[PDB]
Amino acid sequence: GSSGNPEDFKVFKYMKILEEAMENDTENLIEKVRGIYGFKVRNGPNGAEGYWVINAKEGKGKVTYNGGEKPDVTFTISDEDVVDLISGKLNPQKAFFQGKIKIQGNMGLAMKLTDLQRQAAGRIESI
16 A cells, blocks of 8 residues: 655644644643544545554643554544544544544543544534
8 A cells, every 4th residue: 555654644734733732722621531542544645544643541642653552442534534524624423424434432432532523623603
């Protein structure tokens, strides 16, 4: 599988701000959802594939390429669609259903991850 550099992925800048943003919340909700996240991102620049590990288990929330640690939950998304998911434009719910999101749900942890994605949606209004 042709794998170009991870910087060329759209998720690069998103996961880099993910790193900050998760803990950037003043009440560091990362401590509620302490876990290790594995992001398997496909459909890279030229059919490339990437994998970043978000260590939130320590309450840090840092993302590292080939983390080496066992992620409590792992997601599988396309580099193209991640931008809508992380922006709150594309529903990870509908994405899960349509195969854009393949996540091994942890009954406790991924539900708090479900809580965090509510914040990542960036919605203020009711509809």
